[PDB]
Symmetry: D2
Subunit: 263 residues, 4 copies
């Protein structure tokens, strides 16, 4: 097992199509002992290979964050610490992402999306670093925001902020001998993405997303399967392992290499 004996916190499980669900499944297959967070979820988490305690965590709730380390210690047992943390939380209201014009997103919506998608990566690291072992690893989920694109809109801005937050989290994490990195994935057909392909956002957005995904598989030298999240989950586990011990404040691209090719 790649993660044999490691105690890992995994956030962001909502459905069995969430990348966190696949990260947690592979982490358990690789011998990790998990602690899960959520804010209904118990039903979904019961579908994982092994039973894991589920803790309540609303990242926008400061009381949940202040009590988190103590609640995790209770779940893993006094004297034990975490070796890993997976931040797999991302949100942007429909005004800031999708069909809505970029200029029509109110700041209250954009701010909510940035709180959950970017700032919470620092919040979780602040709460959990005091109960992390040296050699530990914090991993977040990204979508390459280096270039603008249709529809992603203000979520592109939140991902750009997340990448910046990750570099500062690495500075803090380093004091504990802990690494902090992001996995930039290619398009993933989740419960939300499938509906857009299904035409829930209209024919215009449906065509734009179809062109975005078809372009990915053709640019990716090894191809890209938007229905298979496993290569992304394995990449997160590689960062949670001891096999990338000199990588921190960084971004690993699990995108079929699409970002390295123009056409």
């Amino acid at each position: 097992g790649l993660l044999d004996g490691k105690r890992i916190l995994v956030s962001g499980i909502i459905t069995d199509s969430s990348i966190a669900f696949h990260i947690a499944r592979v982490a358990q297959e690789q011998g990790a002992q998990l602690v899960l967070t959520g804010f209904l979820i118990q039903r979904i988490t019961d579908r994982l290979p092994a039973k894991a305690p589920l803790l309540e965590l609303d990242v926008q709730n400061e009381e949940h964050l202040a009590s988190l380390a103590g609640r995790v210690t209770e779940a893993i047992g006094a004297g034990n610490k975490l070796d890993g943390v997976v931040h797999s939380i991302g949100f942007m209201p429909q005004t800031g992402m999708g069909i809505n014009p970029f200029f029509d997103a109110p700041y209250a919506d954009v701010s909510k999306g940035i709180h959950i998608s970017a700032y919470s990566y620092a919040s979780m690291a602040k709460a959990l670093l005091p109960i992390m072992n040296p050699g530990g690893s914090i991993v977040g989920m990204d979508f390459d925001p280096s270039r603008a694109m249709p529809a992603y809109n203000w979520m592109t801005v939140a991902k750009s902020a997340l990448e910046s937050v990750n570099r500062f989290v690495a500075r803090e994490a380093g004091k504990y001998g802990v690494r902090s990195n992001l996995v930039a994935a290619g398009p993933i057909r989740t419960l939300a993405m499938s509906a857009i392909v299904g035409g829930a956002l209209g024919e215009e957005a449906g065509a734009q997303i179809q062109l975005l995904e078809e372009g990915w598989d053709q640019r990716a030298p090894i191809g890209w399967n938007m229905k298979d999240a496993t290569p992304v989950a394995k990449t997160v586990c590689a960062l949670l392992s001891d096999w990338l011990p000199a990588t921190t404040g960084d971004i690993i691209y699990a995108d079929g290499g699409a970002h390295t090719q123009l056409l």
Copy 2:
């Protein structure tokens, strides 16, 4: 016979005569531009400072966090420049982050309300200003924002770095919208300007002049102001959604 002869340019962000916006404004006027200035909160203080500029320019109130100020902005600019006239340039020179998110305070101790305020003013407002002003901008027009390279983390800058990373992303989307009006949108990434953390910030500033192949004078905003004017001119007509580094070339050198 100036670089910006006949151009109507809005310049936001003048607070003191050491503000980058003050030099941008002085250089633009020396190069024959007609200006419209915007000010936040300290309006009477801004009026006295703008009295030191080469030519008189109308001063308009603009709080970027105020939606009413943004909805009325185009109308108020049109009144100032005259009906039938449009802007050829827009300078966004606004940046703010509370002390909890910038300086000596630990990165982890910044409350989100403070970070959100700083991101609103420093990054989101670039889209707000472009939304308000694009309907009154001429083709061939130029929107310029002020940046500080956030590609790498650094001591003390903390959440302001995060806000600059957001700004660069906003700029790329603003360019998509601006292009529909034949308008460019770009940022000028400047080197440090003198407008435990103290020692780290001092080493950051000294390191700039040594890495910069042409050197860097942190007491001189003029090279930065000239760079903004180059982007406001017709001399970079195929550049948009981009970043021009007026940093002495420091970002291109490791040591």
Copy 3:
């Protein structure tokens, strides 16, 4: 009143009137610069092309692979501009890659002799020209090279893309040397100037559009870098590509 009034600028790379160097030279003359031109191999043909320019400018021979041409260059430029005068600007607009390293030919089938020739002319020569000309450059001066964004691989450009990646690296080291003379060194990364799908994709991604038949926006960008308006920019790349490189789709 021109942007480059009184400036003495060397412009290399004119072969045809469609050369980016030709439009750089035309715009710089329109803007009051006094030019010195350099040409390679087909000198009688280059002279004819340079007669199309607004003003007469001396044409000097320069084969960047010829060490004797490089060792005599400063002396020959000084003869053309007059003793006691120095250059304020240098434009490197030279690029070459044999057909084995560029086009339909498989990436793996390019012999190293061909790749080496292309890298010599397209990348190393930027350092060669700066070495020869910085001793005859004025403070506040500007060296500009022509680039095509090589950050990502693409079909057909193959080994030329590798040569552009080398050029960008060379430019950063040339800036270190140039700075000692108070001189800037930068590249202009242009969009395509007239594979078809690559070129059509450019105008659609560019927020302000891209006209591949028009070299003027690129020529103006080079002149902006030759002017005194970007005095704190060096070892850098300015993108005159309609902003295509900042957009995914």
Copy 4:
């Protein structure tokens, strides 16, 4: 082990301080079966590779020799057995004459020397991939060694230019490798001590470059230790980064993500 049953070719062993020596050692500790390639000092390389955990066949390979490249796949097949293919290829070759790297002014490097350095350090990555892709299994991995050339630095000079060319070559090699279901990536390492031989000026510049790394790296950087770099190469040779290609993984203590 991480690389159990995998057949991996490792080039670039010259001394027991070569990053390739450590790559080979970690790969063997992790169950890989190796084929080694050596240049010029073959008898000397044998003495070094006798210091590895297990015995591995050593093949001669001069990357500037087109005959060595044309016969390479056949010679590898003989060493691993007919019907078997490689799952991994490690390019750990770098060279630049002293005229292009060190104390010598950047402008004083003759092109013949720069060209030789680019041939060995950048072009040979495409040469090795061309020779070995026909004898590589799907899911396979090609890894090369890099040093971040995004910014200019003192003394590295023309070797930085060669690394910038290598990164570009890697992106094109990924296009070709993808047709075989093979990944191609580079590992950008921090400085590794592989005295005053360059004088006081260069010595001070190089010392400041190296000390700056450990201070910028949030997890620190041990320039005497190649193991974190060797483990990173093995992570890319494994099946744990299956959607990464034409890319660069930084095993530099995170120094490149920090300004100061």
